[PDB]
């Protein structure tokens, strides 16, 4: 008895932004990687020690975008993300605007439903912040029929002290350092690899814990 | 007093697609990847030094779209072997056809890029661009690529390698420049990233060639009629 049925699409998501929550941050980068349930189930299962790092499914949809913020990145944010408001502006990046919502809506529409976003620390950071950015637009949110889960909770359950930083998890499971860029897409690819460690168990946990994105409280309001 | 045909391109969009077969089969697209890079990000690439130069690092600021598309006809056995895609598997995974919503998606992606914008595709003039024109011609939307320019990177790399003086396949060029094999060949995103690397070899010369040779995508003749 699942709350919202079997999820047919998992969208691995990462957001980068200008700072930490009390700073009222703005998104500077966004990556979505949509995988069908069956592509995850077709991940080959490894019983060796260490398990090889899974490769991504052949069939994936990917969207990665840089976004000009209205406010400057903190020094810590620019160091960690490698992005700056000034550099995003000189490369002509656009704000989080109605055309971006058109793009997101059309990308989501290509995915079989029910669909669930999966983000590392999404419950405390990525999801509330995405909710805030979408709430500013006059466009109705394209995510109001989408579900979501936090992969920190997923991996805590799948593993049954331990750090739950993305890199710490990857190294604990695969016993090699992560090699992805430190970009939103690199973080999404590292998360996909972690989620392919026990893909059937991950899907089961996601099905049991999916909640409507419409219930995510905005990080901050107008 | 000689002028560029369409001004300085502000965005290069590296593009590749996979499809069900070769042109005489009247193929349909099964995968599409666009990778948009601002002129300034390309010009920022560290100068290639040494023999071989290291494979350039992709710019930090890029926009990427990669999509799988259900075709209405089967892939040839050779197309499915090379690309790793089949109609049956794309359908099992619920992929949608090339439709109006996909054109709306592409348009909104393109609208985030500063203009003038130029598509860059390897063998684009004979394959990718005519095929995309055919697919877009079936739709009820305007073309999302009205206003966008295009060029074929085979001609470009022929020019640039002649200047620093052969197969001009994507892999042959990459291996000549960098002395190792590309990865993820014959996948849309893997081949886009290989093309980006080749075009980062001599970015200023590439941008000058592209500026001089860009043509409107609206002038590309469809591969076949509908
Ligand atoms: N030997 C070959 C080479 C290319 N092709 C077709 O050319 C398309 C594009 O080629 P690339 O993979 O080089 O981009 C393939 O997706 C495939 O449909 C083929 O069907 N047989
Ligand atoms: N990988
Ligand atoms: N599993």
Author numbering:
A (entry chain A): 5 to 164, 174 to 235
B (entry chain B): 3 to 167, 175 to 235
Can you provide the manuscript's text about this entry?
Three prime repair exonuclease 1 (TREX1) is a crucial enzyme in mammalian cells, consisting of an N-terminal nuclease domain and a C-terminal transmembrane domain. TREX1 acts as a 3′-to-5′ exonuclease in the cytoplasm and the nucleus, and has multiple roles in cells (1–3). TREX1 is a member of the DEDDh exonuclease family and adopts a general two-metal ion mechanism for catalysis similar to other members. Our results show that RNA and DNA/RNA hybrids are substrates of TREX1, although the activity of digestion is lower compared with that of processing ssDNA.
